[PDB]
Amino acid sequence: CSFGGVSVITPGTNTSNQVAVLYQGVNCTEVPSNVFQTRAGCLIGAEYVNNSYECDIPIGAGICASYQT
Amino acid sequence: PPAYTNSFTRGVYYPDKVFRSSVLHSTQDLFLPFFSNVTWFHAIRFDNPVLPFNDGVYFASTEKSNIIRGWIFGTTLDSKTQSLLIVNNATNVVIKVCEFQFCNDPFLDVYMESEFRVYSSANNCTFEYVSQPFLMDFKNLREFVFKNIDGYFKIYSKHTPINLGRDLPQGFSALEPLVDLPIGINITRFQTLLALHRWTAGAAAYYVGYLQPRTFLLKYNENGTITDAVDCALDPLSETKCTLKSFTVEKGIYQTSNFRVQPTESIVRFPNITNLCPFDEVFNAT
Amino acid sequence: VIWMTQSPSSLSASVGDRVTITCQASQDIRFYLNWYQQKPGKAPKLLISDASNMETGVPSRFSGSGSGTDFTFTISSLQPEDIATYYCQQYDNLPFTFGPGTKVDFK
Amino acid sequence: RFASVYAWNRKRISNCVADYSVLYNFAPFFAFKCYGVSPTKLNDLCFTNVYADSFVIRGNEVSQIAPGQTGNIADYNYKLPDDFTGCVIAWNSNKLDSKVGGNYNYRYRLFRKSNLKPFERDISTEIYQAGNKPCNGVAGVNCYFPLQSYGFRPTYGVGHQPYRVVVLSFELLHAPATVCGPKKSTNLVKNKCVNFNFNGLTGTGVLTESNKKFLPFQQFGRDIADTTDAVRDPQTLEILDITP
Amino acid sequence: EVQLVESGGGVVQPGGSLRLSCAASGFTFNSYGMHWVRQAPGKGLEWVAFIRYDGGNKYYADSVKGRFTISRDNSKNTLYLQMKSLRAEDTAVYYCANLKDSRYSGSYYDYWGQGTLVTVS
Ligand SMILES: *[C@@H]1O[C@H](CO)[C@@H](O[C@@H]2O[C@H](CO)[C@@H](O[C@@H]3O[C@H](CO)[C@@H](O)[C@H](O)[C@H]3NC(C)=O)[C@H](O)[C@H]2NC(C)=O)[C@H](O)[C@H]1NC(C)=O
Ligand SMILES: *[C@@H]1O[C@H](CO)[C@@H](O[C@@H]2O[C@H](CO)[C@@H](O)[C@H](O)[C@H]2NC(C)=O)[C@H](O)[C@H]1NC(C)=O
Ligand SMILES: *[C@@H]1O[C@H](CO)[C@@H](O[C@@H]2O[C@H](CO)[C@@H](O)[C@H](O)[C@H]2NC(C)=O)[C@H](O)[C@H]1NC(C)=O
Ligand SMILES: *[C@@H]1O[C@H](CO)[C@@H](O)[C@H](O)[C@H]1NC(C)=O
Ligand SMILES: *[C@@H]1O[C@H](CO)[C@@H](O)[C@H](O)[C@H]1NC(C)=O
Ligand SMILES: *[C@@H]1O[C@H](CO)[C@@H](O)[C@H](O)[C@H]1NC(C)=O
Ligand SMILES: *[C@@H]1O[C@H](CO)[C@@H](O)[C@H](O)[C@H]1NC(C)=O
Ligand SMILES: *[C@@H]1O[C@H](CO)[C@@H](O)[C@H](O)[C@H]1NC(C)=O
Ligand SMILES: *[C@@H]1O[C@H](CO)[C@@H](O)[C@H](O)[C@H]1NC(C)=O
Ligand SMILES: *[C@@H]1O[C@H](CO)[C@@H](O)[C@H](O)[C@H]1NC(C)=O
């Protein structure tokens, strides 16, 4: 039965209070807006784009995230 | 009909009688949860209910007169079993734990200040207490927290002057302890006393919220006062702040908790069957 | 499990008569017992809480007494809206157990 | 005026500090039997309820105020339970409770249906009907008055003199704090490695003047890593640092 | 003025599952520990379950301990009873009750529901 750690990504309090959560190798249908499925787990609270920028907050397996837009 | 109010950061009390310097201490006790729905009673026409207790009570009130003038705690609010009574005179509070035959609509009766409209029997009390202030130290908020552990109570109190707002203002103020009574009483029901001036009253309003077992992170400054607190189950960023034991979280992934799907039901399959060893021949012979 | 028994489980009495209903427990419940009334087809309305404290909105015909293991529900007069089924409840040990219930009828 | 033995008082003792040394140097104390507790240690214990019963009895019946006894006092006048943890105190009062010419105001009940329960008090005056026939409130043959008056002439032997009795019964039921004694104390030296106790806090270290400020409700402080580093002296109310 | 409206009753195959829902609106709710009570058709009232004010401790009857679960949602003010592995001895009228306790829940008013007919055929 799926399981795994839960980590909280904060752009850094100083900037804001939003946060996104990655559930490591958890499918987005078995977790319990912006929901994105990646091979590294289920990413909730960030939208996935096809552009590219410099790493900001490493998420793992090629993906990153950062207060922007 | 009910009427609710959002209590933002209210009812944070000092957990123990210990001085602490500029220190973020993580405690786990009965606290009123952050950003909760407290109930905004009026009882003014005159209708004050008998509320449960369940785990303490946070009780706020905003009254410039002297109307909310004590409390009644108990389990049946009758004879045969004991009950606690906090009455609040103009000079001193008198806590009394006797087998009160409580009336249906209890109130004090002021001109002279009588007591015979509250109860009608005072048999066999084993506890008496007299302290001076207990109440009244633009408008002024007065907050109390009652909780009864094991056998003895605990009343925490804080009286603060506030400006005109939602009567539960956006801010922070820690509650400092008042008394610690060795009563030895099961308490599950309570209601509030009033004074009626001899019929006709003013305009009461009190806010009641219920305490729950929560983990808090309190921040004591240099002088030992609490200036801020973080409720470790209010979202994800508060879980991160309780993991780091800090109030400032810089930029990056911060691992906090563990995700482990639970079970559900519980099938239990086995093998069909076979020989059935006939009781047909022994219970049913000719 | 605290078993309860009620007596008599069938009863027929006319107007103005008095009705006693004994609730007997298998353990000791001190004064924690509720007496409900259920008219047929509706949710049960409570009448007596903690075996002696009659409520508000109920007439003063009903009365409750007894303690320990034996309790007593007493109707001093049968009005035609007293025809219902009466139930017990205990409170000390979870689970709470209702009684089997007694039926009052007219002659 | 102590009350007579069939109708004894019962003073419930509420919250106090209880110095038992005023017991200890008060009277000659013909009998002083502490049962559950030993009397040299009473000034350092907390009790919840201290029930003080009080009466008078004859001198050869002071041995009947004990758990599990027989005779016309302990059967049906005053029955101590067999789960007893109090202290029975008894002293002579022939100087006070006995007058010349008979003192007919101390009575004991000598006939009853059966015994009492522990701590049971009766004030009945109904004529015990020993015989098979009713005598409807008129005593005489086979039905007697139940309360007989004591004697207490001064010219009676020790063993017929009025002995006053106070029975203390301590119990510790539920409450986390109640009537308790006033323990030791000692002095307060400074700048010396000593063994200290500050209202429960047991430790070792050097006591020095502090510069911390506690909130009137706080007794002691702890440092980072959760170890006590300052206390407030219960008696003098001063804040002292503890170095190890 | 109190409203306890319940839903989820209907024909259930034996060994099936249901979610009985009790929408509560009126009193404050979530200050009272609430109960599920059932009545078999033609029989007396039984007892099913009890849940505290915070959803902390749940207590079940000694006959259905394990086949039912009781939960509450304090955001929408609802009670839920998950009924799995139903036999034919569970066809009943389920009431969503708030019993005038005074030892455990500490309530003072007696608020009963209306009752759903759960027919297990
Ligand atoms: C305050 O509340 C307490 C809990 O809510 C009550 O405690 C109850 O006391 C009972 C004894 O008086 C216990 O009964 C015993 O239960 C155990 C197992 O539960 C049995 O083995 C014993 O045989 C039984 N006692 C007897 C004489 O049969 C209750 O279990 C206990 N409740 C709980 C939850 O443990 C207090 O009584 C109550 N105080 C007052 C004054 O009401
Ligand atoms: C006990 O024995 C009797 C007789 O053998 C059984 O009765 C038979 O029951 C079956 C089915 O119920 C019928 O088809 C037969 O016709 C019955 N026979 C007679 C002679 O009546 C009875 O069923 C047996 N008990 C059990 C539990 O099997
Ligand atoms: C405890 O009792 C002692 C009694 O010695 C109190 O000490 C006295 O307090 C008064 C009031 O300030 C002073 O005037 C005396 O000089 C003190 N006595 C000595 C010997 O210094 C002490 O204040 C009491 N403490 C509390 C908290 O009440
Ligand atoms: C963040 O805010 C703090 C004050 O709260 C300030 O000292 C610090 O310089 C700020 N950081 C940045 C990058 O501006
Ligand atoms: C999650 O489950 C769905 C089917 O419910 C499936 O289509 C999807 O690929 C799964 N995601 C991952 C990451 O396996
Ligand atoms: C990114 O590009 C892929 C094709 O390479 C396309 O299938 C996908 O939809 C694009 N994603 C978004 C968010 O447009
Ligand atoms: C307070 O009540 C309102 C309406 O009843 C509800 O929308 C809100 O979610 C409640 N607050 C909390 C914290 O549940
Ligand atoms: C309140 O009670 C105290 C003692 O119980 C008494 O001295 C005082 O006069 C009372 N207050 C009033 C206003 O009578
Ligand atoms: C107090 O006295 C009453 C007499 O009416 C008695 O019933 C009760 O048990 C006593 N209380 C206690 C705690 O013994
Ligand atoms: C409280 O702390 C401030 C500094 O934050 C200090 O200036 C003030 O003197 C302190 N108050 C006391 C009573 O020590």
- Residue B249 within any structural domain of the chain: yes
- Residue B233 within any structural domain of the chain: yes
The answer, for B252 touching chain A at a CB cutoff of 8 Å, is yes
Question: How far is C6 from D183, CA to CA, in rounded Å?
Answer: 58
Assess whether the C-beta atom of A34 lies below 6 angstroms from ligand 5. no
CB within 8 Å: C95 and E60: yes
**Ligand in nearest proximity to the CA of B148:** 1
Which of A2, A23, A29, A48 is the best mutation target for the ligand 5 pocket, counting ligand atoms within 8 Å of the beta carbon and taking the most? A29
DSSP letters along D149-214, please?
E----SSS-TTSS-EEEEEEEEE--S-SS-SB----------SSEEEEEETTEEEEEEEEE-----
State phi, psi for D43 to the nearest 5 degrees.
-85, 10
CB within 8 Å: B80 and C56: no
User: Which tokens hold the place of D185?
Assistant: 């104390």
| Residue C61 contacts residue C77 (beta carbons within 8 Å) | yes
DSSP letters along E72-93, please?
EETTTTEEEEEEES--GGG-EE
Residues found in chain A: 69
Q: Which residues pair with B253 in a beta bridge?
A: A9
- Give the burial class of A6: count Cβ atoms within 10 A of its Cβ; 0-12 exposed, 13-18 middle, 19 or more buried: middle
> CATH number for the domain including C8?
2.60.40.10
Amino acid identity, position D214: F
State phi, psi for B258 to the nearest 5 degrees.
-125, 140
Give the H/E segment covering residue D21.
helix D21-24
Amino acid identity, position C20: T
Half-sphere exposure of B64 (CA within 13 A, CB side): 5
Find the angle CA(D207)-CA(D210)-CA(D216) to the nearest 5 degrees. 110
Sorted by sequence, the CB contacts under 8 Å of residue B59 that are 6+ apart come out as B71, B143, B144, B145, B146, B206, B207, B208
Amino acid identity, position B138: F
| Residue E3 contacts residue E24 (beta carbons within 8 Å) | yes
> Are 3 or more Cβ–Cβ pairs between A and D shorter than 8 Å?
no
Question: How far is D33 from D169, CA to CA, in rounded Å?
Answer: 12
| Dihedral (CA of C4, C48, C107, C14) sign | positive
Question: How far is D180 from D47, CA to CA, in rounded Å?
Answer: 6
Q: What is the CA radius of gyration of chain D?
A: 27
Residue with tokens 């249908």: A29
Whether the ω angle into residue E14 lies within 30 degrees of 0, i.e. cis, is no
Give the H/E segment covering residue B190.
strand B189-192
Nearest alpha-carbon partner for B96 in B107, B85, B88: B85
Q: How many domains does chain B have?
A: 1
What chain E holds in terms of domains, given with CATH numbers, is 3-120 (2.60.40.10)
User: Which tokens hold the place of E88?
Assistant: 């034919």
- Which residue range is the domain that position C20 belongs to? 4-106
Say what the alpha-carbon torsion angle B163, B164, B169, B171 is, to the nearest 10 degrees.
Answer: -30
Nearest alpha-carbon partner for E107 in E33, E19, E57: E33
For chain B, report the end-to-end CA distance as a whole number of angstroms: 75
Say what the alpha-carbon torsion angle B201, B203, B207, B208 is, to the nearest 10 degrees.
Answer: 20
Sorted by sequence, the CB contacts under 8 Å of residue B25 that are 6+ apart come out as B217, B218, B219, B220
Q: Which residues pair with E11 in a beta bridge?
A: none
Sorted by sequence, the CB contacts under 8 Å of residue B184 that are 6+ apart come out as B151, B152, D48, D173, D174, D175, D176
Nearest alpha-carbon partner for C104 in C51, C37, C44: C37
Which of B85, B91, B108, B129 is the best mutation target for the ligand 8 pocket, counting ligand atoms within 8 Å of the beta carbon and taking the most? B91
Residues found in chain E: 121
For chain E, report the end-to-end CA distance as a whole number of angstroms: 36
Assess whether the C-beta atom of B103 lies below 6 angstroms from ligand 8. no
Q: Neighbouring chains of E at 3+ CB pairs within 8 Å?
A: B, C
Q: How many domains does chain C have?
A: 1
| Residue B247 contacts residue A17 (beta carbons within 8 Å) | no
Helices (H) and strands (E) in chain B, counts: 1, 21
- Give the burial class of B266: count Cβ atoms within 10 A of its Cβ; 0-12 exposed, 13-18 middle, 19 or more buried: exposed
Question: How far is B73 from D98, CA to CA, in rounded Å?
Answer: 51
Query: Which residue pairs, CB below 8 angstroms and at least 24 apart, start in E47-54?
Result: E47/C95, E47/C96, E47/C97, E47/C98, E48/E81, E48/E94, E49/E81, E50/C94, E50/C95, E50/C96, E50/E104, E50/E105, E51/E79, E52/B54, E52/E105, E53/B52, E53/B54, E53/B55, E53/B210, E53/E105, E54/B54, E54/B55, E54/B212, E54/E30
β strands within A1-69, DSSP E = 3-10, 20-24, 35-38, 41-44, 57-60, 63-65
DSSP B241: H
Question: How far is B234 from E30, CA to CA, in rounded Å?
Answer: 18
Amino acid identity, position D160: H
Resolution in A: 3.1
Amino acid identity, position A17: N
| Residue B57 contacts residue B206 (beta carbons within 8 Å) | no
β strands within chain D, DSSP E = 9-13, 31-34, 49-57, 87-92, 107-109, 128-129, 143-144, 147-149, 163-171, 193-198, 201-209, 220-222, 228-232, 239-243
State phi, psi for D143 to the nearest 5 degrees.
-155, 120
Tell me what percent of chain E is helix, strand and coil, each rounded to the nearest 5.
Answer: 0, 45, 55
- Residue B78 within any structural domain of the chain: yes
Instruction: Sheet containing D193-198: give its strands across.
Output: B18-19, D220-222, D228-232, D239-243, D201-209, D193-198
Strand, coil or helix: D61: helix
Give the H/E segment covering residue B160.
strand B155-161
Nearest Cα of chain C lies from the Cα of B186 at a distance, in angstroms, of 13
CB within 8 Å: D177 and B14: no
Nearest alpha-carbon partner for C7 in C20, D23, C15: C20
Whether the ω angle into residue C8 lies within 30 degrees of 0, i.e. cis, is yes
Strand, coil or helix: D60: helix
Cα separation values, B86 from B266, C20, D33, D176, E118, Å: 52, 41, 41, 20, 49
Cα separation values, B277 from B270, B272, B281, B286, D63, Å: 19, 16, 9, 18, 75
User: How many other C-beta atoms lie within 10 A of the C-beta of residue C50?
Assistant: 22
DSSP letters along B90-117, please?
SS-EEEEEEEEEE-SS--BEE--EE-TT
> CATH number for the domain including B24?
2.60.120.960
| Residue D150 contacts residue D103 (beta carbons within 8 Å) | yes
- Which residue range is the domain that position B138 belongs to? 4-260
Question: How far is D59 from D42, CA to CA, in rounded Å?
Answer: 27
Question: How far is D137 from B58, CA to CA, in rounded Å?
Answer: 63
Beta pairing, strands B18-19 & D220-222: parallel
Residue of chain C whose Cα is closest to the Cα of B76: C50
| Residue B177 contacts residue B17 (beta carbons within 8 Å) | yes
Sorted by sequence, the CB contacts under 8 Å of residue D69 that are 6+ apart come out as D63, D80
| Dihedral (CA of B105, B106, B108, B109) sign | positive
Among A1, A7, A27, pick the best mutation site for testing chain B contact (most B Cβ within 10 A).
A7
Nearest alpha-carbon partner for D234 in D218, D219, D212: D219
Nearest alpha-carbon partner for B257 in A2, A8, A36, A9: A8
Strand, coil or helix: D59: helix
Beta pairing, strands B51-52 & B252-260: unpaired
Q: How far is CA E12 from the centre of its chain?
A: 17
Assess whether the C-beta atom of B92 lies below 6 angstroms from ligand 8. yes
- Residue B225 within any structural domain of the chain: yes
CB within 8 Å: D14 and B127: yes
Strand, coil or helix: B216: strand
> Which spans in B112-260 are helix H?
237-244
Q: What is the CA radius of gyration of chain B?
A: 26
Residues found in chain D: 244
Question: How far is B90 from B195, CA to CA, in rounded Å?
Answer: 12
Sorted by sequence, the CB contacts under 8 Å of residue A9 that are 6+ apart come out as A19, A20, A21, A22, A57, A59, A65, B252, B253, B254
